[PDB]
Structures are given as C-alpha cells and as structure tokens.
C-alpha cells in the first residue's frame, strides 16, 4: 500500500521552485542594475 509522502514531496517542490524563482529574479535584477548604471554613465559623461 501507500508509502510515500504527498505533502512532503509537495513541500519539496514548493521550496525548490521558490529557490529557482529567487534565482531568476536576482538575475533579472542585476541585469537591470547594470543597465541603469550604463545609462547613467552615458548621460552623466
């Protein structure tokens, strides 16, 4: 009969998914920060 844990693997998926999303966001954020810095440079000098 049943031996695995549904809410346990459910929790794992949430966490890994969470991490993955935080990674994607951090990437998008640094890329925006770099873009902002290049724009400021191109206009300030």
């Amino acid at each position: 009969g049943p031996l695995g844990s549904e809410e346990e693997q459910f929790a794992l998926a949430l966490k890994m998914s969470e991490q993955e999303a935080r990674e994607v966001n951090n990437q998008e954020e640094k890329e925006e920060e770099l873009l902002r810095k290049a724009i400021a440079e191109s206009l300030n000098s």
Binding site: E6, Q9, F10, L14, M16, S17, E20, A21
Partner: protein
C-alpha cells in the same frame, strides 16, 4: 514556447506551449504525454501551486521555465 516539467523520479518532460495556454491546458498536455489524469496533477511554480483557470502569462512562466509536478490521488 518550450518549458519543462520535473517529476518525482527526476525524469523531465519537455512541452511546447504558448504563453496564452492555461494550466488546465498544460495538465491536458501532461496527461496526453504521460497518461496521468489532470485530477492527480499538482503543478508548482515559484513557491506555489498553479491554478487551472490561469495562463502561463499570468504566472510569468517564460521559455525554458521549469514546472514541478507532484501527484495527488
């Protein structure tokens, strides 16, 4: 558009979708490919389970995004 669905065994499924596709559509594709009824599919993305009536666009699920599939009864 291409996305992925990771399963419990580590086996990864690749799907060709459109940003306007709904989650129920995606569950329809997974069923057609894996034979798993939509009733038993839980799709998780960005720390939460996704709802059938919304689109991939509503969850900002882009190309190459990885969705997590866990099963219910």
């Amino acid at each position: 558009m291409q996305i992925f669905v990771k399963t419990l065994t580590g086996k990864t499924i690749t799907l060709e979708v459109e940003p306007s596709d709904t989650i129920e559509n995606v569950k329809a594709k997974i069923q057609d490919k894996e034979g798993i009824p939509p009733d038993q599919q839980r799709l998780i993305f960005a720390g939460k389970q996704l709802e059938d009536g919304r689109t991939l666009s509503d969850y900002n699920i882009q190309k190459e995004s990885t969705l997590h599939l866990v099963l219910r009864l």
